[PDB]
Amino acid sequence: IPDYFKQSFPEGYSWERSMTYEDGGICIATNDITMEGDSFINKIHFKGTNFPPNGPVMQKRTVGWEASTEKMYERDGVLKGDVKMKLLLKGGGHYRCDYRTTYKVKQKPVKLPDYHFVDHRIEILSHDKDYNKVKLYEHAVARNSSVIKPDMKNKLRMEGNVNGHAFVIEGEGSGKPFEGIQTIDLEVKEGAPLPFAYDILTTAFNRVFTKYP
16 A cells, blocks of 8 residues: 655645535635644645534534545546545434545656555544634544654644634644554634534644554
């Protein structure tokens, strides 16, 4: 299994992602990821619209993303990732979302004959009342059908706009890229309090943190 994300450094890479929710809510995100010494730096832009006023996102009735399997595959030399995602809801239901991501990695003609999987677990470990301060965690492992150190920092900034509401979120974190685990502490810098479910942002908050063989 080729690790196209770790081989994109020190150059860096970027991704763009569409997130289509079953009730018409739609979210678009890009991330431009670079490297400064010990740290990965993420510049994220996030737009979402057409979330129903009484749906689970505007009423904050969500309680985390379920474990997911994202399929990594090559289409005309472009590395892509598809995953169907489920947001657990208060009351016990599920709120479905289709993810389509294009991973613009350093090797611009990628060739996998031959697709592979990335299993995800993502969880908000802690948060305050209005999610102005959030501790986020991710576990990612890939499996079959000296630039990057064992410990690394991960900084990010998100400029976002969700149903008309602008906001800015910054974060500092760390992880173990070869083990595929990472944490980050996130702070709403503008637009507090967020009037929507924080869960729609967490997957935008870097596949370099993935356990590849």
